[PDB]
């Protein structure tokens, strides 16, 4: 438990020094903290937050004080208390698996993965979040990028068959065209909403494609009817029926990425956390599979020099080769093992006859009302897997992190797009605006926004990670452990973030669909 008032008095006792108001404030807050034995977990943390606030005040007021060492050590005790308050007061997790597929028809691959979770979690309610108003964003994004490609190939048509037109100069010349075609749709969209507010996105898109690119609406209507039917048969949950999310101040950020930027991934980062906050449960990317029974391959020792991802892929590749829960699965890694070690995997799987002996079930889980558990990989945290109770404190901090991070972006982006300038002038005007507002504490965050307009159309662009991605979760965790809000410069080490780790026993992360969907962007091909 946390140190008591009398102990802290003895801890920072300095003879021949006056009892400062800022000091007694710390003792008053700590004494009344130890009387909150009946309050909620959140209320207990909001108290430790004030205690830390007052301690930071004292240290900043009396910089040469002899109490500082004791109070700087007392600060560490407060962080320890938060983690103990986290790992000791646990409530049941809302048994809900949240998946997301928005802006297009759900893929057969995603449905297969999802069913694997259903088969081993019959007590969990599944929700595949879709947008009934926006099934054509994907085809729209594909229609414009494809037309923008041909227009870029029409130019440079004389030198595309020889060098001097590398993939670097091609994507640049193509983006300025995409920006004009993208800027044009947003104007038509914005003008159609004020003229007829009863229209949905799909109504604006399918008429926009029928005029500027000669698309058949009868084929688009049948694509919507097909996409709606397919997802409703698989635990579909319409975002337009998510009233709490649709009324909050984070819905414009969702529609900003969906309609204007066509970044379905970013719109999912915004949606997943708000759903987890309002309902609670477990979010999972569609390329995640249930955890493997720990005692399954216990007898096959892992090689010394291989990575963890290798072995996890081997385990899944072996399971799918011999049980075929997902047909056509790869074996790139299982085929790298000795013939005798392959026989070991084959043998153990031959002794198993049911899936419950292969994949584990989530079952009765419990988490702190303060925490949001996140997945881990060799690069750090990753929001492909999340576990949180309803209305957890971190989920609110994470939402606030994203909402605050989009303000800084849109504060410098809106004044640049409002002017009907080309891509190059907008980018330069957008970069000149971030470096002005850039203060020596959010530098890294601002250094990642200069590419915001090029997301989805360029290789190796990772701005989503900083806006709504894991970077915003790391900042939220820092907000918690630092008793503050609005963190921008991450100073947490791996050991700090491991307090919010999802156990590797609950998620199989190194799947084929995941190791194929990730970044692999040396794919300079040039088409034909």
């Amino acid at each position, epitope marked *: 438990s946390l140190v008591n008032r009398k102990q802290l008095e003895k801890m920072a006792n300095v003879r021949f020094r006056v009892q400062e108001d800022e000091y007694v404030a710390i003792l008053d807050a700590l004494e009344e903290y130890h009387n909150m034995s009946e309050n909620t977990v959140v209320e207990k943390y909001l108290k430790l937050k004030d205690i830390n606030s007052l301690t930071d005040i004292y240290i900043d007021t009396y910089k040469k004080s002899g109490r500082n060492k004791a109070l700087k050590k007392f600060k560490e005790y407060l962080v320890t208390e938060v983690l103990e308050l986290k790992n000791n007061n646990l409530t049941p997790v809302e048994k809900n698996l949240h998946f997301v597929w928005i802006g297009g028809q759900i893929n057969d691959t995603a449905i297969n993965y999802i069913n694997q979770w259903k088969d081993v979690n019959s007590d969990y309610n599944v929700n595949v979040f879709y947008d009934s108003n926006a099934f054509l964003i994907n085809t729209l994004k594909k229609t414009i990028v494809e037309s923008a490609t041909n227009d870029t190939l029409e130019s440079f048509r004389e030198n595309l068959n020889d060098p001097r037109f590398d993939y670097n100069k091609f994507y640049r010349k193509r983006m300025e065209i995409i920006y004009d075609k993208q800027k044009n749709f947003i104007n038509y969209y914005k003008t159609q909403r004020e003229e007829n507010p009863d229209l949905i996105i799909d109504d604006i898109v399918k008429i926009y494609l029928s005029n500027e690119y000669s698309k058949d609406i009868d084929e688009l209507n049948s694509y919507i009817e097909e996409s709606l039917n397919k997802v409703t048969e698989n635990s579909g949950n319409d975002v337009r029926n998510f009233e709490e999310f649709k009324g909050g101040e984070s819905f414009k950020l969702y529609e900003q990425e969906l309609v204007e930027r066509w970044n379905l991934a970013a719109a999912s980062d915004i949606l997943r956390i708000s759903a987890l906050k309002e309902v609670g449960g477990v979010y999972l990317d569609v390329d995640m599979l249930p955890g493997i029974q720990p005692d399954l391959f216990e007898s096959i020792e892992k090689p010394s020099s291989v990575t963890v991802d290798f072995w996890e892929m081997v385990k899944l590749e072996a399971i799918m080769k011999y049980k*075929e829960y997902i047909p056509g699965y790869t074996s790139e890694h299982f085929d790298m093992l000795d013939e005798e070690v392959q*026989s070991s995997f*084959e043998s153990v799987l*031959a002794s*198993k*006859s049911d899936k419950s002996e292969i994949f584990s079930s989530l079952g009765d889980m419990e988490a702190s009302p303060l925490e949001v558990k996140i997945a881990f990989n060799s690069k750090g945290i990753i929001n492909q897997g999340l576990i949180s109770v309803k209305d957890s404190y971190c989920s609110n901090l994470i939402v606030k992190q994203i909402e605050n991070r989009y303000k800084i972006l849109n504060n410098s982006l809106n004044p640049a797009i409002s002017e009907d300038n080309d891509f190059n002038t907008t980018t330069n005007a957008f970069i000149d605006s971030i470096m002005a507002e850039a203060n020596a504490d959010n530098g890294r965050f601002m250094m990642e926004l200069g590419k915001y307009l090029r997301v989805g159309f360029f290789p190796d662009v990772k701005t989503t990670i900083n806006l709504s991605g894991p970077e915003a979760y790391a900042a939220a965790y820092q907000d918690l452990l630092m008793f503050k809000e609005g963190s921008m410069n991450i100073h947490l080490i791996e050991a700090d973030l491991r307090n919010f780790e999802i156990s590797k026993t609950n998620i199989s992360q190194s799947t084929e669909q995941e190791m194929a969907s990730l970044w692999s962007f040396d794919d300079a091909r040039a088409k034909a």
Partner: antibody
Amino acid sequence: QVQLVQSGAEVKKPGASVKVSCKASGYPFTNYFMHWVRQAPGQRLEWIGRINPYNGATSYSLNFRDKATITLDKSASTAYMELSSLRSEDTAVYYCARSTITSPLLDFWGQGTLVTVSS
Amino acid sequence: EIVLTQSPATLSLSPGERATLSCRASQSVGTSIHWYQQKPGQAPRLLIKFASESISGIPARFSGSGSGTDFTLTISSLEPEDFAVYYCQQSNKWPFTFGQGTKLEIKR
């Protein structure tokens, strides 16, 4: 207990086709792969191919990739085995066996079915 | 294609003697070798799985061993009901193949 009851003996002329059945009972049908094996008079056993329940995922031997076609009736817990361009050298017994995994670990076999091909 | 060569083709022994049947593979199959027993008029019966693992309902006198390319089936004491044909199949590589078999004949 566990049983694999196969169709009756068949007799077709060269060119025709034949479908052998294999009804499984006594165990969760969806937990075992259904394999098929040939055995010509006085010759070795030849793996024809396999089908798994819960989906039509099939894998055939190279020799039978063109001649055989394995399907199932999951509703009845049966497996079907069709042979097309019947040749006289296709005269053999045809067994259906269950396996816990993809690869043939044939723990329980059927009585087999004799298909005779001749003019 | 993995060729499995069993030897001998025919083995003449009397009840109570020691039978040792070989199965050679053209390339390493790890330990994924299975043994089957077939008497005339009946379907094969599984004896050993994965070179050496025991099967339920199979007497102890049957045992198997091997690794890589060379595999052995041993019958400690031959019983009259043990005289039949024995096949080995490999399971590690596709397509999956059987041996030609070994006919175990009573010697008189």
